[PDB]
């Protein structure tokens, strides 16, 4: 009942932010893509200074990375999954860092940077080798993309030291 | 009953002779502050609601009494604003003339801070000397225009009486190559002594991210490292073709904000020797002759203008609105001061001892007819 | 942009560097004794006012642009300037079509507590032969009124000069 | 010219904010009255940090206090006037305070307050006797619908020590 009233509370503060109150603290809402970098600060001075993972799923059918942010509360314990839809392929995978509101996502955006496709314009630690040296960081293995049983072949020849097939699925 | 019982509220108002005339209350914790909020406007004559009754022309003299130690700097930001919404031809022998009224009224004023800052530092040498030496200044603005203070000199348009002639002309050129030479008896008991610089040594520190965007504007955060001078970003007056050399320091203790006003001075001075050997061609001092006849209606076409000068203290600006008749709809004189040693202030003295309320009071330079308006 | 110094401002604080401040034990005091060294002030020093009778036309056009609302006019229509509240910014000298009102150097103008030396502040001014009472009679730099001699009923005021004419007029009404 | 490149970057990242440059540094525009609060800080965020006095004129005719805010730059030189129109009742006299974003606003806040009109709801320092003690408080004498000359009566019987009628304008 009470993110109810929380959601209409940030509602009124932003107009694009249909906000859907799930069991009873999990407010999670849409906004579009590059409107939420003037939007996370009226999520971080209302009541949810504390930032979890950017967590990035992404989809091949509808080609968005759609990735969510986690924010959390401190006074009431709610989480909110405030999410974008930004496009798929590198030339357009642009998303605008936040740093200057949350140093939450000075690490997060490294390893969502390095992991898959996605690059963050105004921030510093971005060529740095993080995590998944090269030949890594040639490229991205956690889009829908890079299939494994495939690259694990070209970089392993056998994977069973002992007999048959223990390479397939299923 | 006395309802504190553990802080006592000592508070210098107006008969003090430290504080001018505005009054700090101070939550005295034996020797130290702990809350020091001030009670402004013992001063407040009002010029917003008063200054809107007199035509366009007249509300110069008026307009003068905002600002007491520089008499010119409150005229010739009025005068600037209104050469914009009419839209002058202001000559060139106009704006020499109001060019170095407004740098030896900037010598003045940082001589009036000098000598009210050695009033109530304890040295009177160094007050009787910056007065002796503001008054020679003094005695040659009374051959060009008027009176001492309060010279009411820059209507709207261009200025009211000329330059004599050589005769004054050439007594600049004394006074300033005779202040030049005694500006080195200056550094030697305001700025030398081992007393004042273990006196104001690392009192109220005043950090970077804490002046620029607090409401200071003058040359005491420009001791913090921020890169603005107002002459030198948009120059005005016949500035672009001076070439002084600003302060910027690092610091933002108390004696950095003092160090940078007498480097100010030194380079000021500079200035007005530099100003004076270029000497004004010919030209006329007023502006036009049909546009300022029956001078009470003065139908000035509407808008605004936004004006802005920097002071002793503080860069401060002017608002007019014109509505379109023979008055001024809305004169607003933005003090220096206001959020430049109120606010400021009050983060500025908690933790500082009672012997540096008066001169971290004087190293702002404190004026208080600007708080009030 | 320009920045002059690196640390070239800031000086080294010194142990016996102020007794270059006693240099002047022995030099002549810059004083002056006003009584009596007097001071000469400047030629066009803004004092008091100076109306000419005989070309003031009563137009009111300075009471217009008098700051201080003190340039109020009577009839026998000239004005009577007081100093009650006036700046002296002198917006009524090159504002006055006709002339017919200067600024002579004189400021000096000390009156005391009771009202009959009050009433030395409301003079209609005087023609500019009060510049024979600047110079040729003792020349002090003072208001050369200094009484006024104003009768209920009989309104006929008398500026008691330094020695010269009692100069008496009758007013009756003000304003337009 | 550079200012006209600056509010065309001030443009991109707000859409009301019809921005009018005047002589060279002089960018003046309004914005609608209660869309600033969510809007100051883009324009200190993007190169004005320092605030000076919030000047705020009256309009009888329209009954609106036009609060101007005046913004300023420090590595240009430019004077922002960035301005609202609130009504002009004192049950409407309401206004949203910048105190999160700027520290300037402690203080002019207070004088436009005790002067005229406006109530600034999230600020702590608003009935302090800041200036205009007692019984000058108790009604606001820099708006329109206070008159000199009729106050000053009231307050002081006569305005001449001397004679005729020396209280009177023009
Ligand atoms: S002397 Fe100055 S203030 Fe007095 S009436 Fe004349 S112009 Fe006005
Ligand atoms: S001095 Fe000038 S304005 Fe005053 S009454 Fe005489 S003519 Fe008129």
Redesign the pocket.
Known sequence: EKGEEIVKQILEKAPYAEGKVRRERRLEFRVPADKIRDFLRIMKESNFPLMLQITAVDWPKEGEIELVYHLINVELGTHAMVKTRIPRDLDKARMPTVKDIYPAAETYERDVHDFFGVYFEGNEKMEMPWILDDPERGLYPHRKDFDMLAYVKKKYKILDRFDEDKDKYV | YPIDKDTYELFFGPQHMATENFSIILKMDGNRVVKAIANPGFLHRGFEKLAEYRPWYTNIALLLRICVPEPDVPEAIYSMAVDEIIGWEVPERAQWIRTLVLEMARVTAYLFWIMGLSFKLGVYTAGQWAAAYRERFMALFEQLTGARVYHIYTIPGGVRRDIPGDKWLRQVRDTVEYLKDKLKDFDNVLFENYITYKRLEGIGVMDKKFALEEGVTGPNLRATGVAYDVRKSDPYLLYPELDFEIPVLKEGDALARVLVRRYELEQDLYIIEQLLDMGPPSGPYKVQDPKLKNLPRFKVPPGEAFAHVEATKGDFGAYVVSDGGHKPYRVHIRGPSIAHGVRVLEQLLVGARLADVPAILMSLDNCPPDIDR | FRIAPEEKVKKKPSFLKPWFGLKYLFKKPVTIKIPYEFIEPAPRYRGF?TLDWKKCIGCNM?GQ????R??EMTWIPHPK?DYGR???????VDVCPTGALGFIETYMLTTTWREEELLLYDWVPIEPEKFKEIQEKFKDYKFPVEKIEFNKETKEVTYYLRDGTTFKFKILGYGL
Chains 1, 4 share one sequence.
């Open positions: 006012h300075c642009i008098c700051p201080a003190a340039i300037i006036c700046t002296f910014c002198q917006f009524c």
